[PDB]
Amino acid sequence: MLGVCYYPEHWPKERWKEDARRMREAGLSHVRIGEFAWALLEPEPGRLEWGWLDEAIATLAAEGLKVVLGTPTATPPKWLVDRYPEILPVDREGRRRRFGGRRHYCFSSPVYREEARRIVTLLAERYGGLEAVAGFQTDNEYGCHDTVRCYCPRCQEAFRGWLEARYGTIEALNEAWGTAFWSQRYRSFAEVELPHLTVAEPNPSHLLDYYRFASDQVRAFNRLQVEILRAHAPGKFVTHNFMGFFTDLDAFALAQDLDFASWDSYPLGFTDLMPLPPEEKLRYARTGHPDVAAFHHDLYRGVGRGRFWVMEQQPGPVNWAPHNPSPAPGMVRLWTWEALAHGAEVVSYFRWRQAPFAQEQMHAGLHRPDSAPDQGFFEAKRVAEELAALALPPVAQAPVALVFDYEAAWIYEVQPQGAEWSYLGLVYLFYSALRRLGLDVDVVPPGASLRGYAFAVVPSLPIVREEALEAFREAEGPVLFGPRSGSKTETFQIPKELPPGPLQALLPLKVVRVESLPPGLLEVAEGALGRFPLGLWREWVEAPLKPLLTFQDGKGALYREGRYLYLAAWPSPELAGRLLSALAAEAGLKVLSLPEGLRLRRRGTWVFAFNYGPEAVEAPASEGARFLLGSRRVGPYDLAVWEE
Amino acid sequence: MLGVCYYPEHWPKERWKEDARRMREAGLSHVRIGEFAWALLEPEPGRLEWGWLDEAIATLAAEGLKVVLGTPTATPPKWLVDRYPEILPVDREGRRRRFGGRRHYCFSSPVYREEARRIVTLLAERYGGLEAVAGFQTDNEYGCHDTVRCYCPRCQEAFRGWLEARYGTIEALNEAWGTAFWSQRYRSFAEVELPHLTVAEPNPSHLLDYYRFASDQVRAFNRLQVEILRAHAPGKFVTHNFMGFFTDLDAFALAQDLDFASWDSYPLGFTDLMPLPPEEKLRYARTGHPDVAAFHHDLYRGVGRGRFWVMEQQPGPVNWAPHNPSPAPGMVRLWTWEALAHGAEVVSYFRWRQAPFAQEQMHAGLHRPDSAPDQGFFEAKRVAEELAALALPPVAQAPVALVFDYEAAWIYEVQPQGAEWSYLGLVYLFYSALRRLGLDVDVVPPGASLRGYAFAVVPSLPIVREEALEAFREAEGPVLFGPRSGSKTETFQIPKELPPGPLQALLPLKVVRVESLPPGLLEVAEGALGRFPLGLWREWVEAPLKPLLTFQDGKGALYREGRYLYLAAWPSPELAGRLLSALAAEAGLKVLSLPEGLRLRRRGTWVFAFNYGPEAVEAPASEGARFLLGSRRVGPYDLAVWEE
Amino acid sequence: MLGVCYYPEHWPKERWKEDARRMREAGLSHVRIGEFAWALLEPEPGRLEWGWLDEAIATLAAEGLKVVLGTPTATPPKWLVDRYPEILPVDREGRRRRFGGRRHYCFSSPVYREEARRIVTLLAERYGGLEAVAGFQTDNEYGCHDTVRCYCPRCQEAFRGWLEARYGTIEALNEAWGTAFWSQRYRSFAEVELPHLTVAEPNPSHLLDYYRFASDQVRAFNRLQVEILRAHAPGKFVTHNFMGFFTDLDAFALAQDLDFASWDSYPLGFTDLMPLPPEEKLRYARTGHPDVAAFHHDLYRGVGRGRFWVMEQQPGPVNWAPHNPSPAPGMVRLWTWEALAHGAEVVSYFRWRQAPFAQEQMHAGLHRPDSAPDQGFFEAKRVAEELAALALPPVAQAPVALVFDYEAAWIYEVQPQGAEWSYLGLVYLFYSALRRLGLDVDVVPPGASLRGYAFAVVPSLPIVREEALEAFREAEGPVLFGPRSGSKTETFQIPKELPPGPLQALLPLKVVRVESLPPGLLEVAEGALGRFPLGLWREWVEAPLKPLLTFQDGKGALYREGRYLYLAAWPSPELAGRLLSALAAEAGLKVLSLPEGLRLRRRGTWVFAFNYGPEAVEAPASEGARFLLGSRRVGPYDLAVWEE
Ligand SMILES: OC[C@H]1O[C@H](O)[C@H](O)[C@@H](O)[C@H]1O
Ligand SMILES: OC[C@H]1O[C@H](O)[C@H](O)[C@@H](O)[C@H]1O
Ligand SMILES: OC[C@H]1O[C@H](O)[C@H](O)[C@@H](O)[C@H]1O
Ligand SMILES: [Cl-]
Ligand SMILES: [Cl-]
Ligand SMILES: [Cl-]
Ligand SMILES: [Zn+2]
Ligand SMILES: [Zn+2]
Ligand SMILES: [Zn+2]
């Protein structure tokens, strides 16, 4: 199913009927509206004007379109901000932000909590029972513009309450943080402040708990809205639109209070911001890196416990990246089918028509400002026509699972120890390695069952809790643990047994020292798998095990015991590919050496081939395969679907 | 005529007579003093000490030197600052600046407005009628050190008043800014704040009006002083010293209240700061890029409605650039003759003698700190001797006009959409293209008559007002419009007809999409003019017109209809040169393919050839040409003047 | 003698006896403790708990270990900070810092002065007479984390008092600073503020006095503690641990109140932060640049009037650099013997055991967190065993002296005039030049006698006082003055006679102009010494002297008159090496062209050869030389000691 993000409040009411009609002709079935309409729903404090919203919903409903309503807490009215100044967030620098853009509010502000409660309850009671309404989107991209973590007075006092609940006694906190160090000892929770603007570096345990707290604050803010929607809008789904490459917010945790996860895909923008090699940045400027959208579809399908939507899909050039190219001809269609192949229930485009005013006037839509259809429109219409004839098989369990963890991201954010150490970069590297082997991937959280997977990859899991350990023990196939795994306790301390901590119950090895190396410093690690120049991060492993790969000084780089493997160094794409290929073979999985721009994704017995260009490539379809869409020869920015 | 900037207050009174005498022997006729002497004119609040200033003026007058007095509002006394703390400006970060340097005052401060009024009136009444005084310079470089835009309380309230005058009703402002977007809607002007420190990006219309307002504040501050000088100092000219590569202040607008424009040329400093290719940064380290001074002489001659002075001319190394080389031997003379060739009425050097103390102790002067003459002195004296024998012909209208616009600069500053998009860079690129063809240029504002020009170039004019449109319609020769021209309405919105907006009355084409591309991403645009790899910025043009240049995907890069041309992509120096050359030929203009370091400028029937080095070059003088200065073979850092 | 930094308060009391015992078995004789224990010594305001400290000292004393006690003023308890908020420092940006790390206090705070006085007096009275205590370390690394210079209210008022003492009358200050410039004139000391956040650049004289003041504040704070230790702890030495590449604090001045200087060596961390050529950054990642530790041993031996300790020695990877490699096998031993060869009385390692919690949990120690001995332990034990059999000859005067000056650093920090101008970089360049010639170096301050030196090098001495001049006049061998020497008066003004100012009494030459050039801009300076492409900085010298090296334009680059030489340009390593080699030969000193990774240092008749790798090299030992340690063939990361 296809949808679109619409803003009735940006156009003359006369255009509404025409818009709704063309949305239906285009083949769209869902429409999202209202997330930025607070100032229009309540221009004056207490004076509610539902007139236009009732009409807009009515207009869309008349064309048989399902409405997705978003609560408007992302952008509170200027009068509300002026009334309660405490609502405005304070950056890490200590400066109070201002009205003028969006997301100018703090998750700790108790006043904003009540203001949100009020408007959401009103909205929920009024439209909660409508048949035209299919569900809601809470707020809009929690955390965008670095807003998950706030540094105002409200946060400091809220942080103390959080800490007391977690530790009970200030004594437990002192021990956990190791406050004897640098005379940081606290006499009471009242003495603890936010971990910012400290002389020298702040305490890692202190900073991590702050990150945990910040994320929890967002979930609490969201939970409030979900409770209201469940009480006054029964039967209507509730979701939230997560972002690409964003870890400040624990999406796994927050999604527990949702019916399914949704996310906003802008491949070109993410790619322009990614530090890719020179050649790739140019090659994928108009397509996005081949795995940029796919990684997130897999992640969010996992975050949504198997269900997710692409609430916002790029339909043309955006406005916020340093460089904003136009998607190449056919990419909007490719991204759409890709999302669907990865299991997206709905792919909704942002937005229906390009706005001629304000901040995002340069952000394209399915239509230009003069209402003429833009390139994205024709591509979406095409997908609608193709989809009508192609009911999709169900999404099956992928052969490989990738264990992703938000907490891990916070830990490495707090203590990189190596300037080039990157959690997302490490995760992405393993992901692309699997993808280049033609393998489908399921992203899951620590503790989730690995039952049924041929093998699993854990880019890095610094903290290994009992639940996670159990899931690993019950694993039916091999599990590869990345560097720094099990290197921290829950309180951000080095395990008494040293890394890999709890994992030592599975692997008889100890990391006695780690190194972060300057770029360019490489040393070959070699063995039966091959020869691999490696750098950036290296660990000294003490173990009775014969390493599978050894550096020139004789130190091991990769170890294995039973079904468990441990990588003691930052992997290169080459090593990741060969190691993963070897595991796939051992598991009886067939693999393909896909060319640089080709990607595959299965759905049932069907196989989708997406060509990110710039030249045509042949789809590795079995002989006699029956093509449902496209042909064996896949042109650039094009695709193919067949029965394998 | 030649002059110099002098600081009597920096030297023992005994040196004054000797200085005045040597200024006359050197051949100087004008001397500027007093812009930084407030603390010396009023060391105690209310206690005026004109003793030294009366004597200094007397001393200079005795040698027959014309005095140019500058009002001292650029640097208010520490006691005045301590009295009225509101005077101190606040940076974009929200921090209050302090005394210690200069320009530490806000243009909005109503108190400073009165303090300025007072000191200027006193100064004007006392010296306004003196025969020794030829005129005044108001303040000193408005905006230096990013001081045009202030973010204190005074600015916020002053901005509201400005907005109400411009829009009348808050309704008109909401519509203009499109405040429905992100619930930015305002109930009254009282709710509008300064467009800074907002979460996410501020509204472009909001930010643009703030820039318009900031510039207007400076003009108002200046207008006050001009009114006083016109009332108490009749017959005495009034000017201001503008800066190189500075657009925060609308020089065209402010200069309307002046008799002529003046500017401060420091080629070496501007060049070290310019992002030039590696080879050029080294080649022109001691000379300045060949067009750095020339572009500004042309710009300011236009800003001054045909009249301008170089109030400050670099005579040796400066102190403020990351790298401060010495001008190569002969460059001070070259820069001086160049300024004169471009029509400068007076070329005044900063400064007479290098100060041995304070911030600019490393800034050279015509004399070293021990009073011995420095290299600049001999070069200036030489120009004086040469000039005495060479009365100059009048400045004629250039064959080509370049339409420059400060408002355009603000728009692109507010919305670059592409990280490498640069208004000054685009302007400079077209300028150097014309200059390398040996063509003289006149810089004019939008709306100014293009009557008499062979053809005109408009690097980019986002907003096209009726007056500008009219000037284009009445154009006698071709007009080339650069990318993004006519892409915005006065309220920073996309024209209903889409770009190029009003220009569509002249060119039947529409820009339906634009792209900003990462550096290195190039695609050949080809046609009869040649083959040109282009990047950075590209536009999709919908039109019945057959493009003159076409990209590999078939999209047009350059269009023409009648006398109007439109460039839909960022030009390379190669394209700019060939396109401009083709236009010159069509207009019957003769062109020359000047070598990299050679530049020409005419004055009457005379032609000046300036060689920026590093090696000698031949001046392309017609046969039998009569040389007034130099020879056909122009050594590096040297020049030639002949009758063509 | 060898020692270690220990933190009893970080481990269970049960481990104390075992630790003390193993410290003795390892061969250690000194142990430092207590610098970060304030919060443990006084958890409650007024409640002193010396229990654990008495026991720890007792435990260490029982093994026959000498205790080095550090006063705990570096990290004041959170309750003390909460009580007196004024204690917290304010950064240059104007932001108040917070508790959470360390060094969160201001040197100006009069309240903290008394709090320090109290705790230090208590500590001194209680342990001052113990036989187990050998001495004290005041605070801990004054200035770490840019804390020497503070910008709070206390500093502003303290700065005024300082200024009045130095100048007497505001008139003398106005003249010294040249406040006539930009109307900076002051009516009284009360009007002078801190030189920060000024519009445009602050006055150099103003900023320099602030730097002088800031350093003096630290010495005063330290002097207080020294007075207390001399009164209540007679016979016990007093020292302080200075840092590498840190000039904010005048170590020469402060060390006058100490018995000897101490410093903290972390070669890997300093090197990763040094801007070395690509090849060297990789080659020395695990060893540190060959001269990084040595330069500081020489500097601090000089700062300590001939006596110094390495209070903290890197024993493994650290946690604070962008990249933290492990020292290569044998480097801890090499660094230890190197320090001893340079005269270090004691080499104390930081730290005994790696902490499993807090900020430096990734900072290695002699033991891992599980108490197992780490690589550094075995290397230190080896040095202990080797040292026992090798009593060392006394340190003799080096053949060459290098004149280092902290004030010079402040001047160039205030006025680089060239972006790449670097005082430490210039000093280091001359130092490495001498070191590559196999020459030993003594670092001394201006004014110190140069009697006995073959020749001396003065990288740069902007201000030349009478004492310094006298020392130069009495020099027995040649003295080489680097660029910008004698270019400033004590009040940061250009000497009336122009640079090199007072040095013109020794050299008949004047610097009439200087240039700072962009990187890549090079010009050959040539003469009998060779041909040298030079750049970055160049001076125009007016003199009757025939330059020894001349640029292509005929301007001199190097001059000499009698025993005095003057370099008018930034030297390349090649020029520094040849110039220094020529001077050594003339002085009858023998020199060696040591390979890139080899370094030598003598002690008595012994010669130490340190090989920084990566490959083996031959020690240039005279024939028949008797080796005390190692062999003629020195493996990488290894060393040799022999009788020459
Ligand atoms: O591409 C820009 C988009 O970024 C987010 O997805 C946001 O939710 C949208 O409202 C829009 O601003
Ligand atoms: O080159 C430095 C100069 O910069 C501006 O031109 C200013 O007006 C002068 O006073 C001087 O500071
Ligand atoms: O290597 C890190 C070290 O830095 C300084 O030397 C400090 O005095 C030590 O306490 C430790 O923090
Ligand atoms: Cl829309
Ligand atoms: Cl002067
Ligand atoms: Cl320890
Ligand atoms: Zn807040
Ligand atoms: Zn202001
Ligand atoms: Zn302070």
Q: Which amino acid type is present at position C401? A: A
Q: CB–CB of B198 and A355 under 8 A?
A: no
Cα–Cα distance, A51 to A185 (Å, whole number): 58
Peptide bond before residue C315 is cis, with ω within 30 degrees of 0:
no
Q: Which amino acid type is present at position C539? A: E
Query: What are the counts of helices (DSSP H) followed by strands (DSSP E) for chain B?
Result: 18, 26
**DSSP collapsed to 3 states, B86-125:** HHCCECCCCCECECCCCCCCCCCCHHHHHHHHHHHHHHHH
- Among B35, B141, B338, B539, the one annotated catalytic: B141
What is the β-pairing status of strands A564-567 and A479-481?
parallel
Which 201-220 residues of chain A touch chain C by CB within 8 A?
201-206
Q: CB–CB of A282 and B521 under 8 A?
A: yes
Q: What is the resolution of this structure in A?
A: 2.2
CATH number, domain with residue C402: 3.40.50.880
Q: Is C102 annotated as a binding residue?
A: yes
Q: Which amino acid type is present at position B123? A: L
Phi-psi region of B11 (alpha: psi -120 to 50; beta: other; left: phi over 0): beta
User: Chains A and B: how many Cβ contacts under 8 Å?
Assistant: 172
Of the three residues C337, C369, C394, the one that is the final residue of a domain is C394
Quote the DSSP letter at residue B71: -
Of the three residues A345, A369, A394, the one that is the final residue of a domain is A394
Residue A221 belongs to what domain range? 1-394
3-state secondary structure of B371: coil
Cα–Cα distance, C253 to C213 (Å, whole number): 12
Q: Which of B181, B494, B521 is opposite residue A369, by nearest beta carbon? A: B494
Cα–Cα distance, B327 to B318 (Å, whole number): 10
Radius of gyration (Cα) for chain B, nearest Å?
Answer: 25
The enclosing H or E element of C236 equals none
Cα–Cα distance, B461 to B442 (Å, whole number): 17
What are A400's strand-pairing partners?
A441, A455
Q: Which ligand is nearest to the CA of A151?
A: 7
Assess B496–A contact: CB distance below 8 Å, yes or no: yes
| C349 and C406 part of one domain | no
3-state secondary structure of C531: strand
Phi-psi region of B64 (alpha: psi -120 to 50; beta: other; left: phi over 0): left
Cα–Cα distance, A303 to A247 (Å, whole number): 13
Strand locations in B465-545, DSSP E?
Answer: 479-481, 510-516, 523-527, 530-534, 537-542
| A24 and A154 part of one domain | yes
Nearest-Cα residue of chain B relative to residue A98? B198
Cβ-based neighbours of B186, under 8 Å, separated by 6 or more: A78, B170, B173, B174, B179, B192
Q: What are phi and psi of A217, to 5 degrees?
A: -60, -40
Cα–Cα distance, B280 to B278 (Å, whole number): 6
State the CB neighbour count (10 A cutoff) for residue A558: 22
Cα–Cα distance, C368 to C622 (Å, whole number): 42
| B347 and B452 part of one domain | no
Most B-contacting residue of A362, A363, A615 (CB-CB within 10 A), to test interface: A362
Cβ-based neighbours of B467, under 8 Å, separated by 6 or more: B446, B447
> According to the entry, how was the structure determined?
X-ray
| B571 and B600 part of one domain | no
Q: Which of C93, C181, C517 is opposite residue B358, by nearest beta carbon? A: C181
CATH number, domain with residue C247: 3.20.20.80
Cα–Cα distance, A481 to A478 (Å, whole number): 10
State the CB neighbour count (10 A cutoff) for residue A232: 18
3-state secondary structure of A364: coil
Q: Which amino acid type is present at position A435? A: R
Q: Cα distance from C253 to chain B (closest Cα, Å)?
A: 27
Measuring CA to CA, how many Å separate A416 from each of A211, A420, B339, C362?
15, 8, 56, 10
Dihedral sign computed on CA atoms, order B106, B110, B111, B115: positive
Q: What are phi and psi of C407, to 5 degrees?
A: -60, -40
Q: How many residues does chain A have?
A: 644
Catalytic residues of A: 141, 312
Peptide bond before residue B283 is cis, with ω within 30 degrees of 0:
no
Q: Is B451 annotated as a binding residue?
A: no
| B486 and B551 part of one domain | yes
| C109 and C182 part of one domain | yes
Cα–Cα distance, A487 to A500 (Å, whole number): 5
DSSP string spanning B375-422?
HHHHHHHHHHHHHHT-PPPPPPPPSEEEE--HHHHHHHHH--SSTT--
3-state secondary structure of B526: strand
Q: What are phi and psi of A618, to 5 degrees?
A: -90, 135
Residues lining ligand 3, CB < 6 A? C 140-141, 264, 266, 312, 318, 350, 360, 363
- Residue A239 contacts residue A259 (beta carbons within 8 Å): yes
Cα–Cα distance, B203 to B579 (Å, whole number): 37
- Residue B476 contacts residue B451 (beta carbons within 8 Å): yes
DSSP string spanning C599-625?
EEEEETTEEEEEE-SSS-EE--PPTT-
| Whether C93 is catalytic | no
Q: Is A144 annotated as a binding residue?
A: no
Atom 6, ligand 2: residue with shortest CA distance: B264
B581 CB within 6 A, ligand 2: no
| Residue A443 CA neighbour count, 13 Å, CB half | 26
| B382 and B263 part of one domain | yes
Cα–Cα distance, C585 to C589 (Å, whole number): 5
The enclosing H or E element of B553 equals none
| B179 and B69 part of one domain | yes
Quote the DSSP letter at residue A587: T
Phi-psi region of B103 (alpha: psi -120 to 50; beta: other; left: phi over 0): left
| C140 and C283 part of one domain | yes
Cα–Cα distance, C342 to C308 (Å, whole number): 10
Which is nearest to A1 in space by CA: A262, A308, A335, A387? A387
Tell how far the Cα of B349 is from the centroid of ligand 2, in angstroms.
Answer: 11
What are B373's strand-pairing partners?
B367
Cα–Cα distance, A44 to A38 (Å, whole number): 10
CATH number, domain with residue B637: 2.60.40.1180
**DSSP collapsed to 3 states, C269-307:** HHHHHCCCCHHHHHHCCCCCCCCHHHHHHHHHHHHCCCC
Q: Is A361 annotated as a binding residue?
A: yes
Q: CB–CB of A205 and C357 under 8 A?
A: yes
Q: CB–CB of B78 and C187 under 8 A?
A: yes
Q: Cα distance from C195 to chain A (closest Cα, Å)?
A: 22
Which is nearest to B339 in space by CA: B304, B360, B313? B313
Cα–Cα distance, A7 to A286 (Å, whole number): 27
What is the β-pairing status of strands C537-542 and B530-534?
unpaired
| A117 and A234 part of one domain | yes
Measured at the CA of C194, the angle between CA C193 and CA C196, to 5 degrees, comes to 125
Nearest-Cα residue of chain C relative to residue B80? C191
Which is nearest to C549 in space by CA: C534, C564, C536? C534
3-state secondary structure of A582: helix
Tell how far the Cα of B630 is from the centroid of ligand 3, in angstroms.
Answer: 68
Q: Which residue has the tokens 């095990």?
A: A545
State the CB neighbour count (10 A cutoff) for residue B199: 22
Q: Which amino acid type is present at position B153? A: P
Q: Which ligand is nearest to the CA of C10?
A: 6
What are A69's strand-pairing partners?
A33, A136
| C95 and C154 part of one domain | yes
Cα–Cα distance, A285 to A328 (Å, whole number): 9
Q: Cα distance from C628 to chain B (closest Cα, Å)?
A: 52
What is the β-pairing status of strands A556-561 and A549-551?
antiparallel
Tell how far the Cα of B120 is from the centroid of ligand 5, in angstroms.
Answer: 23
Q: Cα distance from B502 to chain A (closest Cα, Å)?
A: 15
Q: What are phi and psi of A168, to 5 degrees?
A: 80, -60
- H helices of C233-364, where? 251-254, 267-273, 278-283, 292-303, 331-341
Q: How far is CA B158 from the centre of its chain?
A: 27
Which is nearest to C72 in space by CA: C93, C43, C96? C43
- Residue B32 contacts residue B347 (beta carbons within 8 Å): no
Which 178-197 residues of chain A touch chain B by CB within 8 A?
none
Q: CB–CB of C356 and A496 under 8 A?
A: yes
Measuring CA to CA, how many Å separate A626 from each of A385, A629, B267, C437?
20, 9, 70, 78
Q: Which ligand is nearest to the CA of C104?
A: 9
Of the three residues A394, A422, A449, the one that is the final residue of a domain is A394
Subunits next to C (3 or more Cβ pairs <8 Å) are A, B
Measured at the CA of C571, the angle between CA C568 and CA C577, to 5 degrees, comes to 125
CA-CA-CA-CA torsion for B137, B141, B142, B145, nearest 10 degrees?
-160
Q: Which of C39, C320, C362 is opposite residue A185, by nearest beta carbon? A: C39
Structure tokens at A219: 């979930």
Cα–Cα distance, C477 to C456 (Å, whole number): 7
Q: Which ligand is nearest to the CA of C365?
A: 6
Q: Report the b/e string of B420-437 with b at 16+ CB within 10 A.
A: bbbbbbbbbbbbbbbbbb
Q: What are phi and psi of A239, to 5 degrees?
A: -145, 180
Q: Is C274 annotated as a binding residue?
A: no
Cβ-based neighbours of B400, under 8 Å, separated by 6 or more: B434, B439, B440, B441, B442, B453, B454, B455, B456, B457, B584, B589
What is the β-pairing status of strands C241-242 and C261-265?
parallel
Most B-contacting residue of A98, A142, A284 (CB-CB within 10 A), to test interface: A98
Assess A355–B contact: CB distance below 8 Å, yes or no: yes
Q: CB–CB of A368 and B498 under 8 A?
A: yes
- H helices of A233-262, where? 251-254
Taking the CA of residue C360 as reference, the ligand 3 atom at the shortest distance is: 12
Structure tokens at B490: 């006065």
B140 CB within 6 A, ligand 2: yes
| A415 and A376 part of one domain | no
Dihedral sign computed on CA atoms, order C386, C389, C391, C396: negative
What are C603's strand-pairing partners?
C606
Overall number of domains in chain C = 3
